[PDB]
Design a protein around this ligand. Structure first.
Ligand SMILES: *[C@@H]1O[C@H](CO)[C@@H](O[C@@H]2O[C@H](CO)[C@@H](O[C@@H]3O[C@H](CO[C@H]4O[C@H](CO)[C@@H](O)[C@H](O[C@H]5O[C@H](CO)[C@@H](O)[C@H](O)[C@@H]5O)[C@@H]4O)[C@@H](O)[C@H](O[C@H]4O[C@H](CO)[C@@H](O)[C@H](O)[C@@H]4O)[C@@H]3O)[C@H](O)[C@H]2NC(C)=O)[C@H](O)[C@H]1NC(C)=O
Ligand SMILES: *[C@@H]1O[C@H](CO)[C@@H](O)[C@H](O)[C@H]1NC(C)=O
Ligand SMILES: *[C@@H]1O[C@H](CO)[C@@H](O)[C@H](O)[C@H]1NC(C)=O
Ligand SMILES: *[C@@H]1O[C@H](CO)[C@@H](O)[C@H](O)[C@H]1NC(C)=O
Ligand SMILES: *[C@@H]1O[C@H](CO)[C@@H](O)[C@H](O)[C@H]1NC(C)=O
Ligand SMILES: *[C@@H]1O[C@H](CO)[C@@H](O)[C@H](O)[C@H]1NC(C)=O
Ligand SMILES: *[C@@H]1O[C@H](CO)[C@@H](O)[C@H](O)[C@H]1NC(C)=O
Lengths: 124, 112, 128, 124, 124
């Protein structure tokens, strides 16, 4: 591996950038102090939003997290090889920008309809 | 003398070889219900803990020294005899809230 | 990982009593027991007993229970993990059989099944 | 299902409200900016308290989380059917208000006496 | 057990202090309000740093957490019994202060090279 650093693989293929995730996970968290204390609070707010989303998805604690929601071809009818070995994450974010809210809800109830299935499993 | 925990009287060895010192007694001080310690003890001077709890070495003890405790006797092997080994070795039986029931002693010569 | 210096070589005569000191350094004196061991000319080594500088607790062999006076001071803390303590040793009915070398021994650990085991020894003191 | 919304099942049975949890989980997180920045900080503080409690309980990441602490009849001697199909969560909070601190401690050590049991399991 | 309290086992052996962890885990989280709001924000910041580190280690939700990184003798060549039944956590922090950053990186990729191994496991 090559320590590309923070956002090192921003122009690399999505498969290459997916190997270097903990690098972007580390660096994610008087009147002028009022402007500095403002940015300090917003920093924890924008960070806890990603964690709250990851928490209600079952991905709490995961950098790579698999799910049960199957990939709708309406979102992107691209093949697997022409995604992870071709496009960059910056490109993939433009192609899925629209449907990015649709998936966030599918993950939310695929988790509630999983811990509900586990609650009935441990009821005997 | 009145040590109810006898050892191996004496023993000899040569450079590069390995010895073995026994340590046993009645069911009142040995063995499967007691921890065995081993002390290198120059004549009436500064001793040195070698092994505690049957087979656990003290800090920094050379990997040569090894301990074993069967259901009736505990052994202290001195693998790879180095010249600075001529001394007397005493064992001791103990529990967590007792004292050291020392042994008779075993002089080990390394003349070679 | 520190020293346990003792007193000199004092020789009295039977019927009397002798006091032996044990000055510690380089370790928290309260964190480990203080064992007393002797090797006499007539037997071999004989464990006398240990005392806890923290609990003030004494445990000694029945062969020395009615003879030994065993005490400790209180540590003068040097740093967060260093101090300077002292343990004292006296005997009652003294004979020429009790002639031998005496040392103090700091315990091995602070917990477990080998907590008091005489690990760090002194230097030796020659009795009568 | 019917998207009742935020606090939609506040007057419903506890069994009905328990199905709609991620809805209340989403919506949980100059001198007047000082009063606004104050509410912004308290928002993350009151949210991280629930997460810190859930974290030291083993429920970190769960909306529904099962435990080992058995139900003491002193807390509520009500039957299961007369709770989930009768009372509302607002009613249940008044009946358990007293004993609500007793259970929070039982969950705390039932977790420490679980990861301690798992530490000895993986020691061989 | 004896409820020693907050930092109760600060001078005890590391094995004794390790049993009382949830006690230190609980108690971890106008111009003078500006100085009070400052300490309130720093409190959540210093707390989320420990959680972000625990999150990218797989320990998210654990008070005691085991790993795959084996103990290098260069860090401390001390035996197990002369650590948990002898030194205090305050002593252990001075002996490992240097190598404390080396281990934090070993935990970071031992987790990414674990969820990557689990992603290939669930790919069939
Ligand atoms: C602060 O720091 C001090 C010093 O480091 C700590 O004190 C040490 O604690 C450890 C463990 O907590 C002790 O090791 C134990 O030793 C006992 C031996 O005690 C038995 O025998 C004694 C003499 O016969 C006797 O005092 C005891 O009787 C009770 O009454 C006294 C009255 O003074 C009371 O003070 C005692 O506490 C006793 O309650 C007792 O009969 C030994 O039994 C222990 O072994 C058991 O437990 C271990 C696990 O801990 C287990 O592995 C064993 O198998 C066995 O089950 C254990 O070895 C040590 O002796 C203490 N003193 C030292 C090291 O000098 C203190 O704990 C620290 N406190 C805090 C809050 O940090
Ligand atoms: C894909 O999404 C559309 C809505 O955009 C939905 O109607 C359709 O059922 C989905 N298909 C699959 C296979 O999930
Ligand atoms: C997203 O919606 C806009 C609406 O105007 C549309 O133009 C755009 O093509 C959509 N994106 C994709 C990837 O289809
Ligand atoms: C219920 O709680 C009381 C204390 O309120 C306790 O004394 C009792 O043992 C508990 N019973 C059960 C079965 O847990
Ligand atoms: C809680 O305690 C108060 C104390 O006055 C008591 O009146 C009340 O009945 C208690 N609650 C329950 C549910 O028992
Ligand atoms: C221990 O760490 C050093 C670097 O400090 C490294 O070179 C060595 O390979 C490591 N050894 C083991 C066994 O991990
Ligand atoms: C840490 O590094 C410093 C550098 O001067 C060194 O003095 C110290 O001994 C090191 N710590 C350990 C435990 O080796």
């Amino acid at each position: 591996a090559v320590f590309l650093g923070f956002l090192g693989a921003a122009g690399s293929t999505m498969g290459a950038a997916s190997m270097t995730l903990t690098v972007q996970a580390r660096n994610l968290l008087t009147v002028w102090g009022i402007k500095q204390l403002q940015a300090r609070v917003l920093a924890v707010e924008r960070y806890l939003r990603d964690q709250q989303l990851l928490g209600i998805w079952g991905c709490s604690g995961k950098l790579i997290c698999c799910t049960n929601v199957p990939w709708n071809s309406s979102w992107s009818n691209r093949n697997l090889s022409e995604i992870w070995d071709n496009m960059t994450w910056l490109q993939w974010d433009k192609e899925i920008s629209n449907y990015t809210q649709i998936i966030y809800g599918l993950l939310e109830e695929s988790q509630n309809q999983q811990e509900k299935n586990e609650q009935d499993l441990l009821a005997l | 003398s009145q040590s109810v925990l006898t050892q191996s009287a004496s023993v000899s060895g040569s450079l590069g070889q390995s010895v073995t010192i026994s340590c046993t007694g009645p069911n009142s001080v040995c063995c499967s219900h007691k921890s065995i310690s081993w002390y290198q003890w120059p004549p009436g001077r500064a001793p040195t803990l070698i092994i505690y709890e049957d087979n656990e070495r003290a800090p920094g003890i050379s990997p040569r020294f090894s301990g074993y405790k069967s259901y009736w006797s505990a052994y202290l092997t001195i693998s790879d005899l180095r010249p600075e080994d001529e001394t007397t070795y005493y064992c001791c039986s103990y529990t967590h809230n007792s004292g050291c029931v020392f042994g008779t002693g075993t002089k080990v010569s390394v003349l070679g | 990982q520190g020293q346990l210096v003792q007193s000199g070589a004092t020789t009295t005569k039977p019927g009397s009593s002798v006091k032996i000191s044990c000055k510690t350094s380089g370790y928290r004196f309260n964190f480990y027991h203080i064992n007393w061991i002797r090797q006499t000319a007539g037997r071999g080594p004989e464990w006398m007993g240990w005392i806890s500088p923290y609990s003030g607790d004494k445990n000694l062999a029945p062969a020395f229970q009615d003879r030994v006076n065993m005490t400790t001071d209180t540590e003068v803390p040097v740093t967060s993990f260093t101090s300077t303590g002292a343990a004292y040793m006296e005997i009652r009915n003294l004979t020429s059989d009790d002639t031998g070398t005496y040392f103090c021994a700091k315990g091995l650990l602070r917990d477990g099944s080998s907590t008091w085991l005489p690990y760090l020894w002194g230097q030796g003191t020659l009795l009568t």
